[PDB]
Design a protein around this ligand. Structure first.
Ligand SMILES: Cc1cc2nc3c(=O)[nH]c(=O)nc-3n(C[C@H](O)[C@H](O)[C@H](O)COP(=O)(O)OP(=O)(O)OC[C@H]3O[C@@H](n4cnc5c(N)ncnc54)[C@H](O)[C@@H]3O)c2cc1C
Ligand SMILES: [Cl-]
Length: 468
């Protein structure tokens, strides 16, 4: 009994659908895109052209909702990369010492991740994916949503899809503001922090011996410097490839051409390591760019009126500058927040509002982490009432940098920093007396003076051909 309609069948839509089918009799997923039968790019998820990191915090939730998915990804060529043992990272504060594993991430093409999650989700016969379908309107009124009116793209026929619960997971281009406007509801407060970040990506075939057991490599901006922030990330993915994504804020955006890409990876960022490694590899694709990098949040949970049976989650409610890599994990946390309110409240009145408030809490750490680091770049454009961003940003950055600095050279501080940065723990965890204690104890290793690559890692950058 009871039925749910999910708008958007991307990451949040698939995750929330898998959860919902354990609580309602049927789930219908409505998407305007066409869906490939295999792990291919598609127009509805254009960000899949760029490096995607699935931090442990999100990965564990994906596993809970769709168990066996992590192993299926690894079996398809995804990499499990330990953090910080599997990363060579020139942070704002210097090189990260590669301490033993504290957290992890899963590294693969977003196309493969999306295909795997969708295939696992649709194993549940009571979830149906309705492709090539437009979302026209929410049915019902401002007091209660009762479904959606859709248009079939092939036939042009419009029809009404009844639902006890509608979940908007249509992503960064969600039309929910319009949909809610047509209901008569007031417009939500919108908050944004826009650093002008632009991403540029190329795929490379790695040297054959480095197709496995190769680290994540990153060169980060120094957000404390009053200069445009530029970054470079090299990430292993399936089938012996490296995805390389460079980025820059206003005044340091990467160029669009193949040659400028390589020079940006060498000279536009603070250390040339990513430039040096891609020179060992074979380029497979030309530069793809994205500017879908604004931190944008819609405070739907604070609206004066909220209709029963409507919930918005994923990028549709809060989307981030992706250099921090939180979007998919934040959506996963938001799904568990809805599940928690469903378990407590079932379908009583109050459910949708309670879930919307719970979702706002679930994305808040990801929101604070991304905006607090973006707000310092030259030229940043903002619209906010958040005192964390307007006033208390000065000391929040003073304590962030003490922890960030000490995390590069102290195993206990690093463990706590990466627990938070992978969304495996909340921000209160940093106020644990033991963590503040380790911070005060400071570095236990020297600061590396060169990239902390292993000899065996660099040895696999050449074939050894040409030698008798
Ligand atoms: C360049 C870039 C890099 C990123 N890197 C990372 C990273 O490293 N780690 C990470 O965790 N996140 C990353 N992200 C964020 C991540 O892509 C998103 O957070 C994630 O896709 C959110 O899922 P979603 O389901 O809300 O949206 P999406 O996955 O985009 O899915 C939206 C779905 O809704 C459909 N749709 C859209 N509009 C409509 C409509 N009007 N009607 C019907 N259907 C509609 C689309 O076709 C699609 O199927 C990155 C994003 C970008 C842009
Ligand atoms: Cl994009």
């Amino acid at each position: 009994t009871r039925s749910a309609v999910v708008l958007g069948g991307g990451m949040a839509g698939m995750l929330v659908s898998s959860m919902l089918a354990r609580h309602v009799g049927s789930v219908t997923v409505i998407d305007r895109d066409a869906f490939p039968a295999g792990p291919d790019l598609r127009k509805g998820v254009p960000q899949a052209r760029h490096a995607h990191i699935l931090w442990s915090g999100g990965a564990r939730i994906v596993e809970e909702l769709l168990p066996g998915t992590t192993d299926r990804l690894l079996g398809a060529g995804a990499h499990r990369i330990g953090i910080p043992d599997g990363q060579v990272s020139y942070t704002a504060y210097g090189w990260q010492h590669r301490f033993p594993e504290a957290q992890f991430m899963i590294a693969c093409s977003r196309a493969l991740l999306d295909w795997t999650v969708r295939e696992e989700t649709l194993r549940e016969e009571r979830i149906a994916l309705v492709e090539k379908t437009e979302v026209l309107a929410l049915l019902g009124d401002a007091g209660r949503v009762t479904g959606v009116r859709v248009r079939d793209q092939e036939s042009g026929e419009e029809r009404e899809v009844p639902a006890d619960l509608v979940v908007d997971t249509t992503g960064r281009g969600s039309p929910s503001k319009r949909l809610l406007a047509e209901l008569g509801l007031p417009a939500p407060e919108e908050e944004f922090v826009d650093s002008g970040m632009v991403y540029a990506t190329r795929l490379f075939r790695a040297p054959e011996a480095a197709a496995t057991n190769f680290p994540l490599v990153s060169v980060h901006a120094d957000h404390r410097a009053g200069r445009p922030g530029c970054n470079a990330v090299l990430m292993p993915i399936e089938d012996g490839r490296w995805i390389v994504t460079v980025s820059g804020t206003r005044g340091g955006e990467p160029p669009a051409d193949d040659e400028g890409f390589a020079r940006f990876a060498r000279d536009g960022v603070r250390h040339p390591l990513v430039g040096e490694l891609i020179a060992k590899a074979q380029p497979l694709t030309s530069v793809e760019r994205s500017r879908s990098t604004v931190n944008r949040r819609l405070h739907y949970d604070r609206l004066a009126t909220w209709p029963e049976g409507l919930v918005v989650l994923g990028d549709a409610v809060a989307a981030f500058n992706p250099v921090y890599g939180h979007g998919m994990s934040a959506a996963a946390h938001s799904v568990l927040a809805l599940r928690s309110q469903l378990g407590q409240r079932a379908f009583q009145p109050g459910l949708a509002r309670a879930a919307q408030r719970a979702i706002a809490v679930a994305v808040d750490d990801a929101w604070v982490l991304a905006t607090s680091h973006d707000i310092g770049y030259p030229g940043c454009r903002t619209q906010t009432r958040d005192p964390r961003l307007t006033r208390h940003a000065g000391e929040r950055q003073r304590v962030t940098d003490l922890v960030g600095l000490t995390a590069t050279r102290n195993q206990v501080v690093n463990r706590a920093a990466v627990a938070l940065n992978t969304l495996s723990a909340g921000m209160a965890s940093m106020q644990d007396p033991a963590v503040m204690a380790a911070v005060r104890r400071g570095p236990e290793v020297p600061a590396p003076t060169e990239p902390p690559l292993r000899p065996d890692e660099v040895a696999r950058l050449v074939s050894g051909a040409g030698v008798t």
